[PDB]
Enzyme design. Structure first.
Site, PDB file in Angstrom:
ATOM      1  N   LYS A 166     -13.844   7.647   1.784  1.00 15.66           N
ATOM      2  CA  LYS A 166     -14.946   8.283   1.016  1.00 15.66           C
ATOM      3  C   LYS A 166     -14.689   9.822   1.077  1.00 15.66           C
ATOM      4  O   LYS A 166     -14.707  10.285   2.214  1.00 15.66           O
ATOM      5  CB  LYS A 166     -16.283   8.048   1.707  1.00 15.66           C
ATOM      6  CG  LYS A 166     -17.416   8.695   0.839  1.00 15.66           C
ATOM      7  CD  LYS A 166     -17.322   8.026  -0.565  1.00 15.66           C
ATOM      8  CE  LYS A 166     -18.354   8.608  -1.533  1.00 15.66           C
ATOM      9  NZ  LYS A 166     -17.873   9.806  -2.194  1.00 15.66           N
ATOM     10  N   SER A 223     -20.496  14.623   0.629  1.00 11.62           N
ATOM     11  CA  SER A 223     -20.546  13.235   0.206  1.00 11.62           C
ATOM     12  C   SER A 223     -19.919  12.236   1.165  1.00 11.62           C
ATOM     13  O   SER A 223     -20.076  11.042   0.766  1.00 11.62           O
ATOM     14  CB  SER A 223     -19.935  12.927  -1.187  1.00 11.62           C
ATOM     15  OG  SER A 223     -20.932  13.199  -2.159  1.00 11.62           O
TER      16      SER A 223
END
Length: 257
Positions: free
Chosen positions: A201, A39
Protein backbone atom coordinates in the site's frame (compact mmCIF):
# COMPACT_ATOMS: atom_id res chain seq x y z
CA UNK A 1 24.32 -0.21 -1.41
CA UNK A 2 24.58 1.86 1.83
CA UNK A 3 21.39 3.58 2.98
CA UNK A 4 23.44 6.71 3.83
CA UNK A 5 24.55 6.63 0.22
CA UNK A 6 20.93 6.56 -0.99
CA UNK A 7 20.15 9.53 1.28
CA UNK A 8 23.10 11.42 -0.27
CA UNK A 9 22.24 10.51 -3.73
CA UNK A 10 18.58 11.48 -3.56
CA UNK A 11 18.89 14.31 -1.02
CA UNK A 12 16.20 12.59 0.98
CA UNK A 13 15.60 11.19 4.47
CA UNK A 14 15.02 7.41 4.65
CA UNK A 15 13.33 5.47 7.43
CA UNK A 16 13.28 1.65 7.07
CA UNK A 17 11.96 -1.21 9.17
CA UNK A 18 12.06 -4.76 7.78
CA UNK A 19 11.16 -7.93 9.65
CA UNK A 20 11.56 -11.49 8.37
CA UNK A 21 8.61 -13.12 10.14
CA UNK A 22 10.16 -16.64 9.66
CA UNK A 23 13.42 -15.85 11.50
CA UNK A 24 12.69 -12.59 13.38
CA UNK A 25 15.68 -10.92 11.67
CA UNK A 26 15.21 -7.10 11.48
CA UNK A 27 16.91 -4.44 9.28
CA UNK A 28 16.55 -0.91 10.80
CA UNK A 29 17.66 2.52 9.44
CA UNK A 30 16.34 5.65 11.18
CA UNK A 31 13.62 3.25 12.42
CA UNK A 32 12.63 5.50 15.35
CA UNK A 33 12.29 8.77 13.33
CA UNK A 34 8.72 10.13 12.83
CA UNK A 35 7.30 10.41 9.29
CA UNK A 36 3.80 11.21 7.91
CA UNK A 37 2.28 7.81 6.91
CA UNK A 38 -0.30 9.31 4.55
CA UNK A 39 -2.30 6.64 2.68
CA UNK A 40 -0.27 3.69 3.99
CA UNK A 41 -2.70 3.98 6.95
CA UNK A 42 -5.48 2.69 4.63
CA UNK A 43 -3.95 -0.76 5.20
CA UNK A 44 -4.25 -0.47 8.95
CA UNK A 45 -7.87 0.88 9.04
CA UNK A 46 -8.84 -1.86 6.57
CA UNK A 47 -7.30 -4.59 8.79
CA UNK A 48 -8.84 -3.23 12.02
CA UNK A 49 -12.31 -3.39 10.43
CA UNK A 50 -11.69 -6.94 9.18
CA UNK A 51 -10.92 -8.09 12.75
CA UNK A 52 -14.52 -7.23 13.60
CA UNK A 53 -16.45 -8.29 10.51
CA UNK A 54 -16.27 -11.90 9.25
CA UNK A 55 -15.80 -12.36 5.57
CA UNK A 56 -19.34 -13.65 5.05
CA UNK A 57 -20.71 -10.41 6.54
CA UNK A 58 -18.79 -8.05 4.22
CA UNK A 59 -21.99 -7.71 2.20
CA UNK A 60 -23.40 -5.42 4.95
CA UNK A 61 -24.34 -2.05 3.41
CA UNK A 62 -23.68 1.51 4.60
CA UNK A 63 -25.36 4.66 3.35
CA UNK A 64 -23.21 7.33 1.75
CA UNK A 65 -24.27 10.93 1.64
CA UNK A 66 -23.09 14.27 0.39
CA UNK A 67 -21.48 15.04 3.70
CA UNK A 68 -19.27 11.97 3.46
CA UNK A 69 -17.43 13.01 0.33
CA UNK A 70 -13.82 14.36 0.57
CA UNK A 71 -11.38 15.13 -2.22
CA UNK A 72 -10.02 12.27 -4.35
CA UNK A 73 -12.81 9.68 -4.09
CA UNK A 74 -12.81 8.20 -7.57
CA UNK A 75 -15.19 5.43 -6.64
CA UNK A 76 -17.24 6.80 -3.72
CA UNK A 77 -18.28 9.98 -5.55
CA UNK A 78 -20.60 7.77 -7.65
CA UNK A 79 -22.31 6.64 -4.42
CA UNK A 80 -23.87 9.88 -3.12
CA UNK A 81 -27.36 9.01 -1.86
CA UNK A 82 -26.56 5.29 -2.37
CA UNK A 83 -25.55 2.33 -0.21
CA UNK A 84 -22.27 0.39 -0.59
CA UNK A 85 -21.15 -2.90 0.93
CA UNK A 86 -18.23 -2.96 3.42
CA UNK A 87 -16.47 -5.19 0.87
CA UNK A 88 -16.59 -2.51 -1.85
CA UNK A 89 -15.49 0.19 0.66
CA UNK A 90 -12.28 -1.82 1.43
CA UNK A 91 -11.76 -2.45 -2.33
CA UNK A 92 -12.12 1.25 -3.09
CA UNK A 93 -9.73 2.35 -0.26
CA UNK A 94 -7.09 -0.31 -1.09
CA UNK A 95 -7.08 -0.39 -4.88
CA UNK A 96 -7.96 3.20 -5.72
CA UNK A 97 -6.85 4.95 -2.56
CA UNK A 98 -10.47 6.38 -2.26
CA UNK A 99 -10.33 8.85 0.64
CA UNK A 100 -14.13 8.76 1.37
CA UNK A 101 -13.87 4.97 1.56
CA UNK A 102 -11.14 5.30 4.18
CA UNK A 103 -13.01 7.81 6.30
CA UNK A 104 -16.21 5.70 6.23
CA UNK A 105 -14.12 2.69 7.25
CA UNK A 106 -12.85 4.71 10.23
CA UNK A 107 -16.43 5.73 11.20
CA UNK A 108 -17.48 2.06 10.97
CA UNK A 109 -14.69 1.07 13.35
CA UNK A 110 -15.93 3.86 15.53
CA UNK A 111 -13.84 7.02 14.82
CA UNK A 112 -10.16 7.77 15.25
CA UNK A 113 -10.49 7.45 18.98
CA UNK A 114 -11.30 3.82 18.51
CA UNK A 115 -8.56 3.35 15.96
CA UNK A 116 -6.20 4.86 18.58
CA UNK A 117 -7.52 2.51 21.24
CA UNK A 118 -6.79 -0.50 19.04
CA UNK A 119 -3.20 0.68 18.38
CA UNK A 120 -2.59 0.91 22.18
CA UNK A 121 -3.93 -2.63 22.69
CA UNK A 122 -1.44 -3.94 20.08
CA UNK A 123 1.23 -2.09 22.09
CA UNK A 124 1.72 0.67 19.48
CA UNK A 125 2.06 3.86 21.44
CA UNK A 126 3.73 5.72 18.57
CA UNK A 127 1.41 5.84 15.47
CA UNK A 128 -0.70 8.97 16.16
CA UNK A 129 -3.90 9.18 14.06
CA UNK A 130 -5.40 12.65 14.61
CA UNK A 131 -7.16 13.81 11.42
CA UNK A 132 -9.33 12.22 8.73
CA UNK A 133 -8.58 12.41 4.97
CA UNK A 134 -7.51 14.69 3.48
CA UNK A 135 -6.17 16.84 6.33
CA UNK A 136 -4.03 13.96 7.59
CA UNK A 137 -1.83 14.75 4.49
CA UNK A 138 -0.81 18.29 5.73
CA UNK A 139 2.41 17.08 7.36
CA UNK A 140 4.53 19.45 9.38
CA UNK A 141 7.92 18.27 10.70
CA UNK A 142 7.15 20.28 13.81
CA UNK A 143 3.93 18.26 14.54
CA UNK A 144 3.39 14.61 15.51
CA UNK A 145 -0.11 14.59 13.94
CA UNK A 146 -0.64 11.60 11.68
CA UNK A 147 2.91 10.27 11.90
CA UNK A 148 4.51 7.06 13.02
CA UNK A 149 8.07 5.64 12.95
CA UNK A 150 9.22 2.88 10.56
CA UNK A 151 9.54 0.54 13.63
CA UNK A 152 6.11 1.25 15.26
CA UNK A 153 4.26 0.97 11.95
CA UNK A 154 5.96 -2.26 10.86
CA UNK A 155 5.36 -3.93 14.24
CA UNK A 156 1.67 -2.97 14.06
CA UNK A 157 1.32 -4.42 10.53
CA UNK A 158 3.05 -7.65 11.68
CA UNK A 159 0.62 -7.88 14.62
CA UNK A 160 -2.56 -7.02 12.66
CA UNK A 161 -1.91 -9.04 9.54
CA UNK A 162 1.13 -11.37 9.43
CA UNK A 163 0.40 -12.80 12.89
CA UNK A 164 -2.96 -11.41 14.13
CA UNK A 165 -6.66 -12.18 14.51
CA UNK A 166 -7.97 -12.09 10.98
CA UNK A 167 -9.70 -15.10 9.52
CA UNK A 168 -7.95 -16.78 6.60
CA UNK A 169 -10.54 -15.45 4.18
CA UNK A 170 -10.26 -11.79 5.38
CA UNK A 171 -6.46 -12.19 5.26
CA UNK A 172 -6.54 -13.53 1.69
CA UNK A 173 -8.97 -10.79 0.75
CA UNK A 174 -6.85 -7.86 2.05
CA UNK A 175 -3.60 -9.45 0.72
CA UNK A 176 -5.06 -9.98 -2.75
CA UNK A 177 -5.91 -6.26 -2.91
CA UNK A 178 -2.30 -5.45 -1.91
CA UNK A 179 -0.89 -7.94 -4.46
CA UNK A 180 -2.98 -6.50 -7.33
CA UNK A 181 -2.65 -2.70 -6.63
CA UNK A 182 -0.87 -1.08 -9.66
CA UNK A 183 -0.31 2.13 -7.80
CA UNK A 184 2.82 0.63 -6.14
CA UNK A 185 4.70 -0.71 -9.17
CA UNK A 186 7.36 2.01 -9.19
CA UNK A 187 8.01 1.47 -5.49
CA UNK A 188 9.00 -1.63 -3.47
CA UNK A 189 7.66 -3.77 -6.33
CA UNK A 190 10.17 -2.04 -8.68
CA UNK A 191 13.16 -2.84 -6.43
CA UNK A 192 12.84 -6.52 -5.34
CA UNK A 193 13.87 -9.54 -7.44
CA UNK A 194 11.28 -10.79 -9.92
CA UNK A 195 10.98 -13.94 -7.88
CA UNK A 196 9.47 -12.05 -4.95
CA UNK A 197 5.72 -11.45 -4.59
CA UNK A 198 4.90 -7.99 -3.24
CA UNK A 199 1.70 -6.97 -1.39
CA UNK A 200 1.89 -3.21 -0.80
CA UNK A 201 0.00 0.00 0.00
CA UNK A 202 1.78 3.24 -1.00
CA UNK A 203 1.21 6.76 0.34
CA UNK A 204 2.19 10.35 -0.43
CA UNK A 205 1.60 13.37 1.90
CA UNK A 206 0.99 16.89 0.49
CA UNK A 207 4.20 18.32 1.91
CA UNK A 208 7.93 17.58 2.14
CA UNK A 209 7.89 15.03 -0.66
CA UNK A 210 6.62 12.55 2.01
CA UNK A 211 6.59 9.34 -0.13
CA UNK A 212 5.98 5.90 1.36
CA UNK A 213 5.45 2.24 0.73
CA UNK A 214 4.65 -0.59 3.15
CA UNK A 215 4.58 -4.23 2.05
CA UNK A 216 4.42 -7.97 2.82
CA UNK A 217 7.20 -9.40 0.58
CA UNK A 218 7.25 -13.20 -0.09
CA UNK A 219 10.65 -14.35 -1.36
CA UNK A 220 10.73 -17.35 -3.72
CA UNK A 221 10.15 -20.48 -1.64
CA UNK A 222 9.10 -18.69 1.59
CA UNK A 223 5.52 -18.59 2.71
CA UNK A 224 6.19 -16.25 5.64
CA UNK A 225 6.37 -12.64 4.45
CA UNK A 226 9.02 -10.13 5.17
CA UNK A 227 7.27 -6.99 6.55
CA UNK A 228 8.87 -3.91 4.90
CA UNK A 229 8.15 -0.29 5.85
CA UNK A 230 9.91 2.46 3.85
CA UNK A 231 9.11 6.12 4.75
CA UNK A 232 10.96 9.00 2.98
CA UNK A 233 10.78 12.84 2.97
CA UNK A 234 12.91 15.88 1.98
CA UNK A 235 13.82 19.14 3.70
CA UNK A 236 11.58 21.45 1.70
CA UNK A 237 7.90 21.80 1.86
CA UNK A 238 7.54 21.95 -1.92
CA UNK A 239 10.09 19.20 -2.74
CA UNK A 240 8.88 16.52 -5.23
CA UNK A 241 9.76 12.88 -4.44
CA UNK A 242 11.50 10.40 -6.76
CA UNK A 243 9.93 6.94 -6.63
CA UNK A 244 13.35 5.49 -7.49
CA UNK A 245 14.51 6.26 -4.00
CA UNK A 246 12.11 3.56 -2.71
CA UNK A 247 12.84 1.07 -5.48
CA UNK A 248 16.53 1.51 -4.60
CA UNK A 249 16.04 1.24 -0.85
CA UNK A 250 13.96 -1.96 -1.25
CA UNK A 251 16.68 -3.47 -3.44
CA UNK A 252 19.37 -2.78 -0.84
CA UNK A 253 17.28 -4.01 2.03
CA UNK A 254 16.30 -7.25 0.29
CA UNK A 255 20.05 -8.07 0.10
CA UNK A 256 20.08 -8.76 3.87
CA UNK A 257 17.40 -11.47 3.68
Amino acid sequence: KELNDLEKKYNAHIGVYALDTKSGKEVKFNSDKRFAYASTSKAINSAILLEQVPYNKLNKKVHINKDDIVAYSPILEKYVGKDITLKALIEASMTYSDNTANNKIIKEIGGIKKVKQRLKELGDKVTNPVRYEIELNYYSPKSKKDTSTPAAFGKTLNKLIANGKLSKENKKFLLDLMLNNKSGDTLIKDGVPKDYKVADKSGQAITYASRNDVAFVYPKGQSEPIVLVIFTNKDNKSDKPNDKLISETAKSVMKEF
